[PDB]
Design a protein around this motif. Structure first.
Motif, mmCIF file in Angstrom:
data_model
loop_
_atom_site.group_PDB
_atom_site.id
_atom_site.type_symbol
_atom_site.label_atom_id
_atom_site.label_comp_id
_atom_site.label_asym_id
_atom_site.label_seq_id
_atom_site.Cartn_x
_atom_site.Cartn_y
_atom_site.Cartn_z
ATOM 1 N N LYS A 166 0.840 -1.194 0.000
ATOM 2 C CA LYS A 166 0.000 0.000 0.000
ATOM 3 C C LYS A 166 0.875 1.242 0.000
ATOM 4 C CE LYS A 166 -2.961 -2.842 2.913
ATOM 5 N NZ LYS A 166 -4.135 -2.863 3.861
ATOM 6 N N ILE A 167 0.476 2.247 -0.779
ATOM 7 C CA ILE A 167 1.397 3.361 -0.950
ATOM 8 C C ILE A 167 1.686 4.091 0.352
ATOM 9 C CG2 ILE A 167 0.896 3.692 -3.387
ATOM 10 C CD1 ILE A 167 -1.057 5.747 -2.746
ATOM 11 N N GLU A 168 0.720 4.181 1.269
ATOM 12 C CA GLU A 168 1.028 4.846 2.540
ATOM 13 C C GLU A 168 2.116 4.132 3.354
ATOM 14 O OE1 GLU A 168 -2.531 2.141 3.248
ATOM 15 O OE2 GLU A 168 -1.683 3.460 1.645
ATOM 16 N N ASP A 169 2.523 2.929 2.967
ATOM 17 C CA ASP A 169 3.560 2.161 3.661
ATOM 18 C C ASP A 169 4.899 2.161 2.940
ATOM 19 O OD1 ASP A 169 1.766 1.406 5.757
ATOM 20 O OD2 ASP A 169 0.958 -0.165 4.436
ATOM 21 N N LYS A 170 5.032 2.878 1.829
ATOM 22 C CA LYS A 170 6.362 3.058 1.242
ATOM 23 C C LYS A 170 7.122 4.124 2.032
ATOM 24 C CE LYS A 170 6.106 2.919 -2.832
ATOM 25 N NZ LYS A 170 5.321 3.305 -4.049
ATOM 26 N N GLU A 171 7.994 3.695 2.935
ATOM 27 C CA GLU A 171 8.722 4.637 3.771
ATOM 28 C C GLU A 171 9.857 3.863 4.405
ATOM 29 O OE1 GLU A 171 6.014 4.209 7.855
ATOM 30 O OE2 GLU A 171 6.210 6.169 6.870
ATOM 31 N N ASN A 172 10.857 4.585 4.914
ATOM 32 C CA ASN A 172 11.972 3.968 5.653
ATOM 33 C C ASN A 172 12.633 2.945 4.742
ATOM 34 O OD1 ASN A 172 11.351 5.572 7.898
ATOM 35 N ND2 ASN A 172 9.707 4.128 8.419
ATOM 36 N N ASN A 173 12.662 1.667 5.100
ATOM 37 C CA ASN A 173 13.266 0.659 4.254
ATOM 38 C C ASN A 173 12.241 -0.217 3.551
ATOM 39 O OD1 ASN A 173 15.869 1.481 4.857
ATOM 40 N ND2 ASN A 173 15.869 0.240 6.742
ATOM 41 N N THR A 174 10.972 0.164 3.566
ATOM 42 C CA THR A 174 9.938 -0.648 2.927
ATOM 43 C C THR A 174 9.596 -0.068 1.566
ATOM 44 O OG1 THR A 174 9.156 -1.237 5.070
ATOM 45 C CG2 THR A 174 7.637 -1.602 3.253
ATOM 46 N N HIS A 175 9.677 -0.927 0.536
ATOM 47 C CA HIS A 175 9.582 -0.543 -0.866
ATOM 48 C C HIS A 175 8.533 -1.391 -1.567
ATOM 49 C CE1 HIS A 175 13.206 2.003 -0.753
ATOM 50 N NE2 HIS A 175 13.634 1.106 0.126
ATOM 51 N N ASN A 176 7.955 -0.833 -2.617
ATOM 52 C CA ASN A 176 7.087 -1.635 -3.468
ATOM 53 C C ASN A 176 7.937 -2.529 -4.363
ATOM 54 O OD1 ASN A 176 5.377 -2.229 -5.960
ATOM 55 N ND2 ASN A 176 3.861 -1.124 -4.690
ATOM 56 N N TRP A 177 7.431 -3.739 -4.628
ATOM 57 C CA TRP A 177 8.094 -4.689 -5.519
ATOM 58 C C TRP A 177 8.440 -4.057 -6.872
ATOM 59 C CZ3 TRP A 177 10.277 -9.314 -6.252
ATOM 60 C CH2 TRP A 177 10.325 -9.804 -7.570
ATOM 61 N N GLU A 178 7.538 -3.238 -7.400
ATOM 62 C CA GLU A 178 7.808 -2.617 -8.716
ATOM 63 C C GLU A 178 9.141 -1.892 -8.748
ATOM 64 O OE1 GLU A 178 3.671 -2.387 -10.687
ATOM 65 O OE2 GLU A 178 5.585 -3.335 -11.281
ATOM 66 N N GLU A 179 9.614 -1.427 -7.589
ATOM 67 C CA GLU A 179 10.876 -0.705 -7.574
ATOM 68 C C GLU A 179 12.040 -1.613 -7.942
ATOM 69 O OE1 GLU A 179 11.508 1.881 -4.079
ATOM 70 O OE2 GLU A 179 9.366 1.507 -3.607
ATOM 71 N N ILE A 180 11.958 -2.896 -7.586
ATOM 72 C CA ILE A 180 13.075 -3.792 -7.829
ATOM 73 C C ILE A 180 13.179 -4.176 -9.295
ATOM 74 C CG2 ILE A 180 12.180 -6.196 -7.637
ATOM 75 C CD1 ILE A 180 14.206 -6.783 -5.571
ATOM 76 N N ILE A 181 12.118 -4.003 -10.084
ATOM 77 C CA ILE A 181 12.205 -4.301 -11.516
ATOM 78 C C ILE A 181 12.097 -3.054 -12.398
ATOM 79 C CG2 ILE A 181 11.508 -6.726 -11.356
ATOM 80 C CD1 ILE A 181 8.615 -5.699 -11.978
#
Ligand SMILES: CCc1cc(C(=O)O)c2c(c1)C(=O)C=C2
Length: 503
Positions: free
Chosen positions: A131-146
């Motif tokens: 969930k976008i409100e949880d992209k913070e600190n060291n938590t990332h969306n999977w899409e970022e890795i690809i």
């Protein structure tokens, strides 16, 4: 050739063929390689290096198998976290494994969020459908890795390096070579039939679990597609199988029992006669193979293995062909020893060609002497053709007049009777005989059965000292089977019995 490079070689030569499919999706070999490459670049761009440990925590999806291969490509050690683990248990493994990254899916992460995010060694946490409100600190969306294209950077992977840690609280450490050798064992056990008109391989065990990881690598390396199912798909397994028609199905014995039971209802009838089914564990599936043939006309196989042995080590390519309980033949390179008891029966000891490196103890690896034998706790006898007859757990063995008696062998005889639906054999203490053999008998059909029928039937088929001293007729045997707990409930069982017959 290590596991990734074997996959790559095949993908580049069979680019257009389907590598993985689900009910609603598919991916070719070439596109799966492209995804693996993007994940590898994302990991390295996020400062993941050869030897870093990544905890992986997700249900069956194409991203899971791509992530395994990306870890292999770059030499990141993957640490699969079983979906049966509680949140506290998941946290314990992330910490114990010294993981510095986590990759999970939405369902698994959000069940475990506070625990995962409180693991201060985690420098990167990637979550599919974060969930976008949880992209913070060291938590990332999977899409970022690809998100970045493959950068064509080199990787230097050597077969003695660590590849993965498979937790049983014992982290079993596999090198690249362990995995090569374990996949090579597994490849021998995946034998779909020749199609009549391409084979898709299905494993009903979660892809986060080591047997399915090996099955998946081995199937892809043989050029087969792999069918991935969701939990809901497997709850609706009969309808799913009619739709997806895999050529080969691995599962627990429980998986196949459920498939059998679903047919008692249904109507259109599922045709598994051409499908190769493999029941997997650390026991014997001979009784299941009889029921499975009656129901589908399919010839059940079994695989016997465990994480400490790297992979499958004993394979029964046709259980039902052998009337006695049996587990099959050692796979190539597997060495066995049967403990000398001054008799033909003894404990099965195994040495596997897939040598695990040791046990991760949180701080270092406790190394395995590569010559060690593993004591299975199972009794066997080896026939002239190599087949391992299965005599049950050593701890279920009964002693009569000094001689060992094996409940699984007596049960196998009993259930052949047309009037006997099921049976469990165990012993109880006896003041002057030491032990006395009791048979729990579940009558078949809507039928009647008298103990005298059974005693005479056993006279023709079993040595007398193996004969039960007593029959407890009950039309439902308590399952959830533990011959130990049934022995402990012997007086309760008698009081609930349809009838008891003491010889
Ligand atoms: C990867 C080691 C391994 C694990 C398991 C398991 O039941 O977990 C199984 C086998 C191997 C197998 O040949 C049949 C069941």
């Amino acid at each position: 050739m290590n596991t990734f490079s074997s996959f790559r070689k095949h993908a580049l030569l069979h680019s257009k063929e389907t590598a993985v499919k689900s009910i609603n999706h598919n991916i070719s070999f070439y596109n799966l390689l492209l995804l693996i490459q993007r994940i590898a670049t994302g990991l390295k761009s996020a400062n993941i290096k050869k030897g870093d440990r990544i905890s992986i925590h997700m249900g069956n999806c194409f991203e899971l198998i791509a992530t395994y291969y990306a870890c292999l490509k770059i030499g990141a050690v993957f640490v699969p976290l079983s979906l049966k683990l509680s949140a506290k248990e998941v946290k314990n493994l992330i910490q114990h494994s010294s993981s510095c990254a986590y990759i999970g899916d939405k369902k698994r992460f959000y069940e475990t969020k506070q625990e995962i995010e409180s693991c201060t060694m985690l420098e990167k946490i990637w979550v599919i459908d974060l969930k976008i409100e949880d992209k913070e600190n060291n938590t990332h969306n999977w899409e970022e890795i690809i998100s970045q294209p493959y950068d064509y950077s080199e990787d230097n992977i050597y077969t003695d390096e660590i590849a993965s840690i498979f937790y049983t609280p014992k982290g079993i450490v596999y090198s690249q070579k362990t995995l090569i050798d374990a996949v090579n064992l597994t490849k021998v056990t995946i034998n779909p039939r020749l199609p009549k008109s391409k084979p898709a391989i299905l494993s009903l065990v979660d892809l986060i679990s080591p047997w399915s990881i090996l099955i998946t690598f081995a199937a892809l390396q043989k050029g087969y597609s792999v069918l991935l199912l969701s939990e809901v798909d497997i709850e609706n397994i009969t309808e799913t199988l009619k739709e997806t028609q895999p050529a080969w199905i691995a599962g627990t014995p429980s998986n196949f029992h459920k498939i059998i039971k679903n047919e008692e209802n249904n109507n259109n009838s599922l045709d598994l006669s051409e499908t190769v089914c493999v029941a997997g564990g650390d026991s014997c599936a001979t009784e299941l193979s009889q029921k499975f043939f009656e129901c589908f006309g399919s010839h059940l196989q079994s695989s016997y293995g465990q994480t400490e042995l790297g992979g499958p080590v004993i394979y029964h390519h046709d259980i039902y062909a052998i009337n006695e309980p049996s587990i099959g033949w050692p796979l190539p390179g597997v060495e066995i020893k049967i403990n000398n008891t001054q008799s033909s029966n003894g404990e099965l000891l195994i040495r596997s060609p897939a040598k695990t490196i040791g046990i991760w103890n949180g701080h270092d690896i406790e190394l395995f002497p590569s010559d060690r034998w593993l004591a299975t706790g199972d009794l066997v006898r080896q026939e002239n053709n190599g087949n391992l007859i299965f005599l049950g757990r050593e701890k279920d063995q009964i002693k009569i007049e000094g001689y060992p008696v094996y409940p699984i062998e007596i049960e196998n005889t009993l259930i052949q009777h047309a009037d006997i639906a099921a049976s469990v054999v165990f012993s109880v203490p006896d003041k002057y005989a030491g032990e006395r053999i009791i048979a729990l008998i579940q009558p078949q059909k809507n039928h009647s059965l008298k103990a005298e029928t059974i005693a005479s039937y056993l006279s023709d088929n079993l040595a007398h000292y193996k004969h039960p001293s007593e029959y407890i007729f009950i039309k439902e045997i308590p399952v959830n089977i533990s011959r130990r707990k049934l022995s402990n409930e012997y007086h309760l069982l008698k009081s609930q019995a349809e009838k008891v017959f003491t010889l």
